[PDB]
């Protein structure tokens, strides 16, 4: 065990080990900055907050946990460290993750940098890239967003999760759908894409019903294929007394875009989530040419969910958490 020392940033308590120093608070789970002086590099630790608290925040613990130690993709956050100050499961209640600090996030970049087509296929690329790689674990994110997403000066591209939100959410979420296929994170994309491209938001709703009469307003009210799917007959009448809009042309929206991002766009930002382009289908998309590699596309090892559907008490989830701390090795 390294010697922990203890310090106060922002009323909030952080016992770390002495390898890392200079924490400057980032973020508030609260994140600092930090110096790796094992490595010489900086490194970002966040705190997990009252991770044990209730049954559902301790499953949530380990399932950030889990999730983190089997990521091992150039796209997508890696795990470097994992530690608690505590030496026992029984004196067990913080939980430290550390990871690789990219210098900023995609919003922070976008804010003043107009960027060229040829950032837009290399940074959507790698976000397609590591998500692939996601999908294929049969994980959803489910919040991507341009601050979920860590840039560094070469403008390459890390997702995460740090913890409007709405503006990058599937229409079939701010519905409760239940169910959610994995495009879910696609549509996220033609949003983020789309504002890559113009510099702007695409749907930058006011609050939960402006943002889908925004979205409708483009993509148009649902057609009769996907009326055709939809079970509830609540659901199906709520819709069809929404305005009827016609389905926008992407190419008179996105005027001076390439047109194969807007060919892209539109395999997105469809409506019906079986009809939306996966993440290994978009990377074959001739929009990236210049940066597709089939053989340098990896995808995940098995990645054993069963926890998920797991009911179990807050200290069997804490234990579990333990242990996987404990089993931790650090990459090369
Ligand atoms: C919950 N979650 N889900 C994912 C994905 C889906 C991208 C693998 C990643 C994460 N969690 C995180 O990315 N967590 C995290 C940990 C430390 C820092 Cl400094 C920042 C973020
Ligand atoms: C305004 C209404 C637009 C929302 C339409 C939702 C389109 C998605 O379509 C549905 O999505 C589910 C996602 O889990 C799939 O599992 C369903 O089988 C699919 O039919």
Redesign the pocket.
Known sequence: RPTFYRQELNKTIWEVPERYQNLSPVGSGSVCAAFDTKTGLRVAVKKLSRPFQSIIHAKRTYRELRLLKHMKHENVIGLLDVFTPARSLEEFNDVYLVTHLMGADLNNIVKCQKLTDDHVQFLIYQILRGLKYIHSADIIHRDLKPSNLAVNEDCELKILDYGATRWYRA??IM?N?????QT?DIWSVGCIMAELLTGRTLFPGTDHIDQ?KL??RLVG??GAE?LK??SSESARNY?QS?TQMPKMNFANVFIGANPLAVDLLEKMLV????KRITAAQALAHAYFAQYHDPDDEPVADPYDQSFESRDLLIDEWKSLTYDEVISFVPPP
């Open positions: 229409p079939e519905l759908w239940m169910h959610y296929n879910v889908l979205i409708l009210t649902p996907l799917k939809i819709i929404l409506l019906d989530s079986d």
